[PDB]
């Protein structure tokens, strides 16, 4: 539609695969490294820093430089950035999912709460529809809170068959804001085992459970092992959107105005910086987890706004907001 050449064959899109970025992948694809929450100033001298919009990403001021791809502020498929998070954070839009999944797999061994030995469960496993399966399994096994070691065979209920070994009790999970809380107990009101126990299911716990689960288990669920691993519903590596995504408002020369999206990235980068600092220099133990819930907040904030708290900060005293669900909706409702 524009001009120039391309030894590359012109073609139309026929299929479209939907998946989730693997932590590995985002790093393979990213061209930046992002460390500084700053943007274009180095001792006043205008340019950019090895931090945000600059490294290999596109440019501004009408400069044809950009990952040796040239072209300029136009005809430039903005290139993606990279940025490593300290402790693994959660992805807002999938939290609900994560639960539903945690309530389907036993904690510690990462094995489906119900096997083929269960005849009810067999029916839900024959269903060939992600929505249905994941729905049919969850409602069926969310009930059991004890990872069975043995289950009555297809024959005489007299003999029991050995299966996933770990009769450990399962927790009852309840969502509280941006975290997941669960309760335990040795039976329901059975001698010497009353009263629950409440601890917070961190992100590292969640990772081991989602990483130990085996393919045949994702299968029964809505995952493909190739484009979507449950473990990828939790963020490890933040993919950085290129400058055309978050343009920098400019009137003539010398006048601020960088998109609300670059602001929430400074917060994520800072909420990440103060986190690495602490674990390295002086770790006050459970006094750090408060800068961890901040990153967990700015990563959730930077993607969506619909919680108890609304981060409208920015440069205004008149609180505004623009995540991404907010941007997609405006464009999904415009199209």
């Amino acid at each position: 539609v524009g001009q120039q050449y391309s030894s590359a064959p012109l073609r139309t899109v026929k299929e479209v695969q939907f998946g989730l970025f693997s932590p590995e992948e985002v790093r393979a694809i990213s061209v930046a490294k992002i460390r500084f929450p700053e943007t274009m100033d180095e001792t006043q001298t205008r340019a950019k820093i090895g931090g945000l919009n600059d490294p290999r990403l596109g440019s501004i001021d009408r400069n044809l430089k950009c990952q040796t791809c040239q072209e300029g502020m136009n005809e430039c498929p903005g290139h993606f950035g990279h940025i490593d998070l300290a402790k693994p954070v959660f992805h807002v839009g999938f939290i609900a999912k994560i639960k539903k999944v945690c309530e389907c797999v036993c904690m510690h061994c990462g094995k489906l709460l119900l096997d083929e030995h269960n005849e009810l469960m067999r029916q839900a496993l024959a269903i060939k529809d992600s929505k249905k399966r994941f729905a049919a399994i969850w409602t069926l096994c969310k009930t059991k809170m004890v990872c069975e070691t043995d289950v009555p065979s297809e024959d005489d209920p007299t003999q029991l068959v050995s299966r996933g070994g770990c009769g450990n009790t399962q927790p009852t999970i309840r969502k509280d804001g941006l975290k997941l809380v669960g309760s335990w107990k040795k039976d329901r009101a059975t001698g010497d085992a009353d009263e629950p126990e409440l601890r917070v299911l961190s992100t590292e716990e969640i990772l081991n459970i989602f990483k130990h689960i085996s393919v045949k288990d994702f299968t029964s669920l809505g995952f493909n092992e190739v484009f979507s691993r449950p473990e990828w519903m939790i963020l490890t590596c933040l993919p950085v959107p290129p400058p055309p995504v978050r343009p920098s408002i400019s009137f003539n020369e010398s006048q601020r105005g960088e998109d609300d999206l670059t602001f929430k990235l400074a917060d994520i980068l800072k909420a990440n910086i103060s986190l690495e600092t602490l674990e390295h220099n002086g770790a006050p133990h459970h006094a750090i987890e408060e800068a961890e819930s901040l990153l967990q907040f700015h990563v959730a904030t930077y993607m969506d706004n619909d919680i108890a708290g609304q981060p409208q900060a920015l440069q205004k005293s008149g609180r505004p907001v623009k995540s991404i669900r907010a941007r997609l909706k405006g464009k999904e409702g415009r199209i």
Partner: protein, 159 residues
């Protein structure tokens, strides 16, 4: 009832015959009754024909029925059309209704009329369950600025 039938001389002859019309149904148990030609027995309940004679029969029935509805208005419509209807309504071995069965689908994709304004939760879920969109729908290709593979766009032009 009248009934054009062949004559031994060859010409078709109007050879009238007695037929019983019923107001209630029990196909399974009337075929058996002796004295009747179990071959020609008919019902306007295709659902019962299917259960007793098999889906292919049902298909014929369902057509015979759809036909009469239109015919009864003096109207006429080419076979190919109702036929196609009757087939779609059949290909799965059983009689499938079309007056909206599913609340989600019938034969669409995860993008056409992104309804619910939840193209938000739909995309998140589509990422979770590695969804493979075929892009054969008009509006899905719109979002890609393409023509759908229909009529005019059902083939590529090249140099």
């Amino acid at each position: 009832y009248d009934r054009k039938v062949p004559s031994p001389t060859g010409e078709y002859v109007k050879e009238p015959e007695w037929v019983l019309e019923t107001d209630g149904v029990n196909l399974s148990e009337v075929m058996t009754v002796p004295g009747i030609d179990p071959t020609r027995i008919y019902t306007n309940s295709f659902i019962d024909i299917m259960e007793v004679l098999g889906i292919e029969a049902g298909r014929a029935a369902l057509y015979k029925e759809v036909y009469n509805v239109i015919a009864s208005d003096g109207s006429y419509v080419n076979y190919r059309h109702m036929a196609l209807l009757v087939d779609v309504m059949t290909t799965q071995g059983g009689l499938t209704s079309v007056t909206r069965h599913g609340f989600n689908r019938s034969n669409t994709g995860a993008l056409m009329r992104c309804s619910f304004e939840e193209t938000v939760e739909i995309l998140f879920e589509a990422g979770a369950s590695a969804e493979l969109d075929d892009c054969r729908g008009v509006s899905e290709n719109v979002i890609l600025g393409q023509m759908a593979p229909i009529g005019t766009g059902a083939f590529d032009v090249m140099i």
